[PDB]
Amino acid sequence: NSPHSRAMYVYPPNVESSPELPKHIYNKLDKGQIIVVIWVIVSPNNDKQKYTLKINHDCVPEQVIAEAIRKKTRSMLLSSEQLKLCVLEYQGKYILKVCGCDEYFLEKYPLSQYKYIRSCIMLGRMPNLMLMAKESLYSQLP
């Protein structure tokens, strides 16, 4: 089986049955938008950097990856064609997970449909997420 399949089997997504967000949960957001923190390892010294994003609650994990690139590329050092290539490149290179936990967001679902996010919203807690390279995920498989 493909490494993508084995990651799905080992780390199955914890999504809700409906993508429709309950009204009492949606009202806890800022006009349906949720503030999340995105971590990443940027240096060989395992130094971690972070971005604080405000995104729609129904963003899929691949849209979170794209939104984090737009946050960084605000300071322009690349053309538009280079930027589009970088978004597609890193969308196929990185996956999203909960920081410090064995909870992953490998499948295309609205972020708020994942159970970890809903508990974060109901608890008034900020989702603490990490961008991990797909190859680093495939190497830790049994």
Q: Which does 65 bind (CB under 5 to 8 A by kind): a second copy, ligand A1AIR, none?
A: ligand A1AIR
Rounded Cα–Cα distance for residues 16 and 81 (Å): 37
Q: Is 18 in the site for ligand A1AIR (CB under 6 A)?
A: no
Within a 10 A sphere around the Cβ of 92, how many other Cβ atoms?
10
CB of 141 to a second copy, least distance (A): 10
Which residues 7-36 are close enough to bind a second copy by CB under 8 A? 8-9, 12, 17-18, 28-30, 33-35
Between vectors from CA 57 to CA 56 and to CA 60, what angle results, nearest 5°?
85
Q: Which does 27 bind (CB under 5 to 8 A by kind): a second copy, ligand A1AIR, none?
A: none
**Phi-psi sector, 46: left (phi>0), alpha (psi -120 to 50), beta:** left
Residues of this chain that bind a second copy (CB under 8 A)? 1-2, 5-6, 8-9, 12, 17-18, 28-30, 33-35, 37, 42-43, 45, 47-49, 51-54, 124-126
